Structures are given as C-alpha cells and as structure tokens.
Scaffold this active site. Structure first.
Site, PDB file in Angstrom:
ATOM      1  N   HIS A   1      51.822  25.113  82.016  1.00  0.00           N
ATOM      2  CA  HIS A   1      52.260  26.255  81.153  1.00  0.00           C
ATOM      3  C   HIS A   1      51.296  27.464  81.239  1.00  0.00           C
ATOM      4  O   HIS A   1      51.638  28.522  80.714  1.00  0.00           O
ATOM      5  CB  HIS A   1      52.512  25.806  79.718  1.00  0.00           C
TER       6      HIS A   1
ATOM      7  N   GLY B   1      44.041  27.521  71.810  1.00  0.00           N
ATOM      8  CA  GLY B   1      42.702  27.779  72.373  1.00  0.00           C
ATOM      9  C   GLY B   1      42.115  26.575  73.095  1.00  0.00           C
ATOM     10  O   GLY B   1      41.187  26.785  73.888  1.00  0.00           O
TER      11      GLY B   1
ATOM     12  N   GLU C   1      52.793  18.221  83.740  1.00  0.00           N
ATOM     13  CA  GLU C   1      52.091  19.323  83.025  1.00  0.00           C
ATOM     14  C   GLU C   1      50.723  19.590  83.654  1.00  0.00           C
ATOM     15  O   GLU C   1      49.949  20.325  83.023  1.00  0.00           O
ATOM     16  CB  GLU C   1      51.984  19.009  81.531  1.00  0.00           C
TER      17      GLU C   1
ATOM     18  N   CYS D   1      43.824  24.282  75.065  1.00  0.00           N
ATOM     19  CA  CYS D   1      44.603  23.812  76.248  1.00  0.00           C
ATOM     20  C   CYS D   1      43.717  23.927  77.478  1.00  0.00           C
ATOM     21  O   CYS D   1      43.013  24.958  77.623  1.00  0.00           O
ATOM     22  CB  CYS D   1      45.945  24.511  76.399  1.00  0.00           C
TER      23      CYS D   1
END
Ligand SMILES: COC(=O)[C@@H]1CC[C@H](C)N1C(C)=O
Length: 182
Positions: free
Chosen positions: A41, A146, A72, A148
């Site tokens: 992402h 904040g 991911e 990730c």
C-alpha cells in the site's frame, strides 16, 4: 531494556532507511545487497526517496501467494551506492507463532520507537482495507498511523513488517527466507 530490544536495535541501526512515496513516509527494512521491503500500500513507483535522497527503483514486485492472494509485501531493488548488511539468516523458513516480539519504527514522526507487543499469532487470512490478505501475524497492541513498515522481531529472528491495525490489534505481513533467494 533487555535482549529483545538489543536485537531490535541492532536491526534498526544497520538495516533500515526512511522511504518516502506519494502515499507517505515508511520504515523500510533492507535485507541484502540493494534489496529492501515495504508494505504494498506504499505504491512504490519508478522513483522513491531514501533518507530524503531521490533514488531510482531498479525493480519492484508486489508479492502474492500461489492462490493469487495479496501478501502486502513489495520487494524493491534500489539504485543505491551502498549494500545492506545481509540479514537473510535471521528470516524464518516457515509460517509460525512467536512469543515476546518487538515492533520497531524509525521515521520523522516516530524516531527510535520500540514497542514490546508480546505474543504474535499466526492469524492467516485478513480483510486488510478491503483486500483479502494471507500470512498475517497478529499482536494485541493498539498500533497507529505512522507504524506501517515497522520491523517485527524476536531474539534472533526478523519475522514481519507492520501493515495495519483495527484500533486494538496490529497486523504484520510475514517475512520468509524463500522470498529472498537470489
Ligand atoms: C541483529 O542482531 C545482531 O546483529 C546479533 C544477532 C545475534 C545477537 C542477538 N545479535 C546482537 C544483539 O548483536
């Protein structure tokens, strides 16, 4: 404060950079040579900022499992003049549960941040922002925006990168040794 934090600090001091994309600032783990990982992402493009330096992306691959389900993890190769310390021998070979994990973050917003998250469950399937996702680890800590790309470690193992939360639990994508065979 103890040997968990000692291992986490040793990974943060040598194997992380601050990555900036159009989707924000992320902790980015360097694994070996010029190869690093970041949450998918982050939407890595042809150019990324690495510690506020314009850097060409040589290759970027959004990993999916053999059922074509999101994992991911994006593996990035950076046009950087310096290699990472090779930490592939700290990656688990198999999906597993863990005790006594630390989540470590380093960005402009959260410098030198370490969180003892405790027990980590092999959760498996998660609907992550509407996207069916596999190989998710779960910990019972209220992680926030904040964090990730934050690194999840135990003593002697680098087991995942933080990719989301629901307010009460945090979720990481597994790192497996087989992702980084060259
Ligand atoms: C990333 O941790 C290291 O570099 C090594 C691995 C083994 C031991 C825990 N250690 C430390 C604390 O120096």
């Amino acid at each position: 404060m103890g040997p968990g934090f000692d291992f986490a600090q040793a990974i943060m001091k040598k194997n992380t950079v601050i990555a900036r994309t159009e989707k924000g600032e992320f902790t980015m783990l360097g694994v070996y040579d010029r190869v690093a990982v970041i949450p998918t992402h982050a939407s890595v493009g042809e150019i990324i900022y690495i510690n506020d330096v314009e850097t060409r992306v040589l290759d970027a691959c959004a990993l999916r499992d053999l059922t074509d389900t999101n994992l991911e993890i994006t593996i990035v190769k950076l046009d950087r003049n310096q290699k990472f310390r090779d930490i592939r021998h700290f990656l688990p070979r198999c999906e597993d549960d863990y005790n006594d994990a630390v989540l470590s973050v380093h960005t402009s917003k959260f410098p030198n941040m370490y969180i003892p998250v405790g027990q980590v469950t092999n959760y498996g399937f998660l609907n992550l922002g509407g996207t069916p996702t596999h190989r998710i680890l779960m910990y019972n800590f209220p992680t926030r925006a904040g964090q990730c790309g934050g690194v999840v470690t135990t003593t002697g193992k680098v087991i995942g990168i933080h990719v989301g939360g629901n307010g009460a639990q945090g979720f990481a994508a597994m790192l497996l040794h087989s992702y980084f065979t060259d």
